Amino acid sequence: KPIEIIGAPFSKGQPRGGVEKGPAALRKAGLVEKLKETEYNVRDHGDLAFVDVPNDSPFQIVKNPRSVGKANEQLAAVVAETQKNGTISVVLGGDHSMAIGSISGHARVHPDLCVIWVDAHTDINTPLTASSGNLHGQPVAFLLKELKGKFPDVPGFSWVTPCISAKDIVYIGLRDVDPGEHYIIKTLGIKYFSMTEVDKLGIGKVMEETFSYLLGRKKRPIHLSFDVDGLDPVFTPATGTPVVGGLSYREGLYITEEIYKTGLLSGLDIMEVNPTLGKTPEEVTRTVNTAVALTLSCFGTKREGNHK
Amino acid sequence: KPIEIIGAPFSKGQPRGGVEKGPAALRKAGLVEKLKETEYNVRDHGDLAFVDVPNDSPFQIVKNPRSVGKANEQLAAVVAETQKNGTISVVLGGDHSMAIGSISGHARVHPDLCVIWVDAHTDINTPLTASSGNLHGQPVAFLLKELKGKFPDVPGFSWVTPCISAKDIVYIGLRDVDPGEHYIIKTLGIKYFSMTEVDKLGIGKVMEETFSYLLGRKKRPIHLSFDVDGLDPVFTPATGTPVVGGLSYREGLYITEEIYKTGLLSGLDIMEVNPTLGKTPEEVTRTVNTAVALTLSCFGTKREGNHK
Amino acid sequence: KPIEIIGAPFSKGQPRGGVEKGPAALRKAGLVEKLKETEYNVRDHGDLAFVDVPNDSPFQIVKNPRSVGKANEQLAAVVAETQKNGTISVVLGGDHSMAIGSISGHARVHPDLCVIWVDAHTDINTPLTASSGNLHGQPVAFLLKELKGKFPDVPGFSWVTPCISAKDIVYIGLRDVDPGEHYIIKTLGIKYFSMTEVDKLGIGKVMEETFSYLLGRKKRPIHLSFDVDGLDPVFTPATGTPVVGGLSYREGLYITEEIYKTGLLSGLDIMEVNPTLGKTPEEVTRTVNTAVALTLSCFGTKREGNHK
Numbered sequence: 001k002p003i004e005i006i007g008a009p010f011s012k013g014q015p016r017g018g019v020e021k022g023p024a025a026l027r028k029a030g031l032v033e034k035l036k037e038t039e040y041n042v043r044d045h046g047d048l049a050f051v052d053v054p055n056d057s058p059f060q061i062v063k064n065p066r067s068v069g070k071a072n073e074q075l076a077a078v079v080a081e082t083q084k085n086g087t088i089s090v091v092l093g094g095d096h097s098m099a100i101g102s103i104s105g106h107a108r109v110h111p112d113l114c115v116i117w118v119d120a121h122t123d124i125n126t127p128l129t130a131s132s133g134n135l136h137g138q139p140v141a142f143l144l145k146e147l148k149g150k151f152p153d154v155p156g157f158s159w160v161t162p163c164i165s166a167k168d169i170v171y172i173g174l175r176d177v178d179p180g181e182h183y184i185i186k187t188l189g190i191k192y193f194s195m196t197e198v199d200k201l202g203i204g205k206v207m208e209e210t211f212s213y214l215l216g217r218k219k220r221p222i223h224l225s226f227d228v229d230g231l232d233p234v235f236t237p238a239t240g241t242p243v244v245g246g247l248s249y250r251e252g253l254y255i256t257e258e259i260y261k262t263g264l265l266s267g268l269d270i271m272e273v274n275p276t277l278g279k280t281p282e283e284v285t286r287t288v289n290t291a292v293a294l295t296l297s298c299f300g301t302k303r304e305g306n307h308k
Numbered sequence: 309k310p311i312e313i314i315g316a317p318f319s320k321g322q323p324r325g326g327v328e329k330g331p332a333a334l335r336k337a338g339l340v341e342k343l344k345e346t347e348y349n350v351r352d353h354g355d356l357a358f359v360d361v362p363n364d365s366p367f368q369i370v371k372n373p374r375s376v377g378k379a380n381e382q383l384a385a386v387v388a389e390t391q392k393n394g395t396i397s398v399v400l401g402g403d404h405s406m407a408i409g410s411i412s413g414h415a416r417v418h419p420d421l422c423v424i425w426v427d428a429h430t431d432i433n434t435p436l437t438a439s440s441g442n443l444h445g446q447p448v449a450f451l452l453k454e455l456k457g458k459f460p461d462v463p464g465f466s467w468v469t470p471c472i473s474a475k476d477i478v479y480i481g482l483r484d485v486d487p488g489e490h491y492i493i494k495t496l497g498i499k500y501f502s503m504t505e506v507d508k509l510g511i512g513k514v515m516e517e518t519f520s521y522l523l524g525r526k527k528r529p530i531h532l533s534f535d536v537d538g539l540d541p542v543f544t545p546a547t548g549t550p551v552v553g554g555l556s557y558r559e560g561l562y563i564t565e566e567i568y569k570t571g572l573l574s575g576l577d578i579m580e581v582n583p584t585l586g587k588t589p590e591e592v593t594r595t596v597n598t599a600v601a602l603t604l605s606c607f608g609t610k611r612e613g614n615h616k
Numbered sequence: 617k618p619i620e621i622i623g624a625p626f627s628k629g630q631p632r633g634g635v636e637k638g639p640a641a642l643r644k645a646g647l648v649e650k651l652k653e654t655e656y657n658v659r660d661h662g663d664l665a666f667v668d669v670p671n672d673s674p675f676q677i678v679k680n681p682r683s684v685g686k687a688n689e690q691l692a693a694v695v696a697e698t699q700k701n702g703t704i705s706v707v708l709g710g711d712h713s714m715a716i717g718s719i720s721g722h723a724r725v726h727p728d729l730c731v732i733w734v735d736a737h738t739d740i741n742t743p744l745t746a747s748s749g750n751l752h753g754q755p756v757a758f759l760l761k762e763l764k765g766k767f768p769d770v771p772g773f774s775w776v777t778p779c780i781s782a783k784d785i786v787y788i789g790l791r792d793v794d795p796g797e798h799y800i801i802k803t804l805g806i807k808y809f810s811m812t813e814v815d816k817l818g819i820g821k822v823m824e825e826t827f828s829y830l831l832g833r834k835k836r837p838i839h840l841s842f843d844v845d846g847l848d849p850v851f852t853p854a855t856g857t858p859v860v861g862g863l864s865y866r867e868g869l870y871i872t873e874e875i876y877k878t879g880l881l882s883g884l885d886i887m888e889v890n891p892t893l894g895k896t897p898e899e900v901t902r903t904v905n906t907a908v909a910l911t912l913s914c915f916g917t918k919r920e921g922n923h924k
């Protein structure tokens with residue numbers, strides 16, 4: 001089971017600096033060559049080439065609808081293709097709206113997969129509840145089966161097929177949820193471990209519960225969508241929406257180490273790394289180094305050491 | 309049900325005076341406006357006027373014994389008034405000596421109240437054991453029954469009536485306790501959770517035990533006195549007496565969230581916030597925001613999110 | 617039970633000159649004076665003068681054998697002498713290669729001693745498994761019985777006799793282990809607590825398990841060899857081999873507080889403080905003060921407070 005690195009230098013999902021530079025920033029640290037050092041074979045697919053949809057006027061409050069939908073449609077076909085080939089797709093991200101395509105592709109092949117979403121945010125606003133109108137804050141809304149039809153058809157997303165049930169997703173790291181989002185997750189019964197549950201339980205018990213809940217009855221593919229703002233700004237400063245009181249570098253690694261151990265990791269997303277938003281170059285260094293370390297962890301690197 | 313913001317720009321409890329600007333800084337951050345966005349209604353009693361006592365000769369070691377005792381005598385009067393109005397009192401103060409007026413006036417109405425003292429210090433020096441003479445380090449000493457008549461009656465504190473006992477206060481965050489203080493807390497059998505206990509049990513079990521101790525025989529009014537230096541200097545740098553290795557931002561919010569969950573919060577103190585002590589504007593903004601964040605949490609704001 | 621500080625200004629164990637200045641930096645932090653103020657009586661033996669060996673050329677790959685050996689031989693005899701008289705030895709070191717002499721000398725007076733190694737590294741590379749050739753990454757290999765006869769006897773170390781068995785040592789803080797080292801610790805079944813275990817169990821649980829393991833069968837003296845890089849670079853930045861995701865300040869203090877509480881503390885090493893590797897003078901003070909706080913903790917200072 002090899003690894004397939006897939007770059008997605010896209011930012012139309014949001015307004016900020018240059019999240020599209022995230023893939024280049026990550027490879028710069030030698031992420032690909034480092035991955036090849038694990039027991040996994042690795043293939044770099046390269047970065048996708050996105051072309052904007054000309055008259056991409058806002059659909060209500062939703063910005064760059066057609067462009068975001070066009071990019072994601074392309075990504076779903078690419079991820080789907082590497083999934084069918086029996087590989088572990090790794091999307092080096094731009095904004096988190098690319099999770100729509102990443103997960104849609106992964107789900108077309110492994111429909112029974114589950115999603116672990118590490119993020120300070122739920123990204124579950126619909127094109128109606130979100131005032132920002134930034135698609136990176138609505139990916140899960142476009143993917144959940146229960147919200148299907150709860151919002152008007154959005155131009156550019158007619159190819160999307162709600163692929164994940166509200167009970168197949170687990171949030172870890174929440175601390176910045178909008179009113180409408182908290183309503184949805186609450187009314188839909190979505191399982192989450194906010195920073196409050198993390199402080200109470202400890203990351204160790206959080207994983208046991210995350211796994212028993214998602215893998216208790218039957219085992220299935222795991223798709224970990226990782227937003228770097230999930231960890232605390234001290235560790236991942238170079239992101240568009242940083243929130244204090246985040247996951248520590250240690251807890252982040254624990255998460256991935258545990259996920260590795262399940263041997264079920266099937267899809268991975270490393271998103272929101274925006275090098276331009278570094279107050280100093282070192283802040284980018286920290287962000288990138290933290291992202292790379294997490295990525296390597298998902299693939300066997302253990303802090304206790306490794307040997308063949 | 310209602311909430312009343314009381315301002316206490318008093319700094320005679322310590323050699324630093326920037327702590328007087330605390331209320332204005334918090335108010336400038338939008339504390340008032342944010343509290344109204346909760347489930348509670350809010351009232352701003354405005355700031356108290358502290359008439360400074362002329363010939364305030366030092367009482368042996370104690371500094372400004374009359375000026376502090378008089379400022380607090382008012383606070384206690386103001387606080388006793390809002391408490392009878394059936395509202396939750398919240399004091400945005402300067403130094404922690406004002407805890408005397410806040411807690412005294414609060415208990416003046418609710419004598420069966422308990423106290424949760426979040427602080428890196430015990431602030432329980434008696435005018436005799438204290439070596440600094442700064443009253444912001446002796447408040448608990450002027451409030452505990454067991455310590456009454458155990459040190460020469462200081463001038464200006466005649467009006468104070470020992471309200472709490474040794475089994476009605478719980479310390480959280482201790483990491484710098486002078487010898488005479490450690491002697492008293494243990495001789496008196498005061499219940500506390502120093503950083504050592506927080507590290508071992510974990511903040512989750514820590515809150516579970518304080519609530520068990522203070523509210524075991526019965527549910528009663530809770531007074532939360534929050535010294536911003538209880539959180540590590542990384543989070544609350546703009547404060548008078550900072551000590552490394554304190555409670556984290558997450559643990560700080562955890563405490564306040566839990567106390568809100570009891571529905572017993574009756575009195576609140578947010579002290580020692582001093583903007584003039586911010587090495588860089590971002591340090592004052594960081595300190596202030598955490599103080600506001602801690603307050604909102606006390607009144608419902610949850611990290612998992614909120615909706616109407 | 618008295619205490620005797622022993623300076624070990626040596627650095628031929630690693631490539632970066634400067635750690636030789638560690639003992640002078642610690643005293644300059646008032647370590648000796650702060651120690652006398654606890655309940656223990658203190659004596660400072662001063663620093664040892666090492667004899668730079670002439671034709672000290674590499675031994676296949678290990679750098680400066682004769683220099684490190686003779687250096688360690690000197691310390692051993694000194695540590696043996698102080699231990700003999702019935703005092704607790706505190707070795708202020710240069711690089712961690714001096715642990716060979718600290719522990720060797722300690723074991724002559726207490727053959728049943730156990731060892732608690734706080735490090736980000738296992739320092740158990742052999743002259744054949746290592747590659748850096750630096751001996752500060754091999755002290756444990758020279759002390760373990762199970763490792764004798766697993767590599768060629770090094771020139772200048774024949775005075776050494778493996779003193780600890782694979783079951784008499786416990787590691788805490790591990791996060792940067794070499795493949796060869798990892799193979800060794802799993803092969804020999806050595807007990808350890810990588811940051812992974814600390815994240816999972818909590819430092820409180822880690823200490824209980826460490827004591828059950830080492831002091832379960834029977835009670836015996838404890839040797840605590842503390843590498844400052846065991847703590848996170850945020851607290852001990854001035855060290856040769858910094859590694860993110862380290863033990864926190866609070867955890868370092870919890871470890872040392874629990875050790876002190878056993879009453880069996882007999883030998884201690886405070887190593888790898890390089891005051892020249894500090895990118896800024898404050899980073900040197902920060903690392904020196906952290907190490908100092910750690911030591912005081914090892915001899916009674918508790919965050920809850922102290923009093924005669």
Ligand SMILES: N[C@@H](CSCC[B-](O)(O)O)C(=O)O
Nearest residue numbers: 096121125130132136137178
């Ligand atoms: N709930 C906010 C959050 S935007 C943050 C998005 B992301 O998690 O991807 O960084 C909104 O609708 O804009």
Ligand SMILES: N[C@@H](CSCC[B-](O)(O)O)C(=O)O
Nearest residue numbers: 404429431433440444445549
């Ligand atoms: N024990 C010290 C403590 S000063 C800290 C006061 B406060 O906790 O209110 O910041 C003294 O007597 O000044």
Ligand SMILES: N[C@@H](CSCC[B-](O)(O)O)C(=O)O
Nearest residue numbers: 712737741746748752753794
């Ligand atoms: N495994 C590395 C570790 S160097 C770290 C040495 B010390 O733990 O003493 O800081 C080597 O063989 O150089």
Ligand SMILES: [Mn+2]
Nearest residue numbers: 120121227229
């Ligand atoms: Mn996010």
Ligand SMILES: [Mn+2]
Nearest residue numbers: 096119123227
């Ligand atoms: Mn996101």
Ligand SMILES: [Mn+2]
Nearest residue numbers: 428429535537
């Ligand atoms: Mn304090």
Ligand SMILES: [Mn+2]
Nearest residue numbers: 404427431535
């Ligand atoms: Mn205080």
Ligand SMILES: [Mn+2]
Nearest residue numbers: 712735739843
């Ligand atoms: Mn070491």
Ligand SMILES: [Mn+2]
Nearest residue numbers: 736737843845
């Ligand atoms: Mn080390």
